[PDB]
Amino acid sequence: PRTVMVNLNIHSDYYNRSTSPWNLHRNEDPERYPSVIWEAKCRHLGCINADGNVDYHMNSVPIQQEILVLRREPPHCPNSFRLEKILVSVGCTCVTPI
């Protein structure tokens, strides 16, 4: 029960040179703001070494960020939302295994 008013009028190629490079995947949800979210997906299980080979002794892992979205509530009523918490992959890094 904590309601506020929001004006929705608003204010690299690392993915490619990274030893843990990634692609983006589109998710669209018309009941959600933002409706389109791009999620990072690691290209490889391992990490690319200085020869351009995959080395599976290291791991590409996605960096997951807690992020909020607006969900329409009650549904289809266009002016009114609840804040939701989701986990989104924003990129990949290379970790030494445990």
Q: Which residue from 45, 41, 42, 43 is spatially nearest to 25, judged by alpha carbons?
A: 41
Contact status: 13 vs ligand RMK (CB under 6 A): no
| Euclidean distance between CA atoms 10 and 33, whole angstroms | 13
Q: Please, which of residues 11-50 interact with its own copies by CB under 8 A?
A: 11-12, 14, 17-20, 33-34, 47, 50
**12 vs 28 by CB, closer to its own copies:** 12
**5 vs 28 by CB, closer to its own copies:** 5
Contact status: 15 vs ligand RMK (CB under 6 A): no
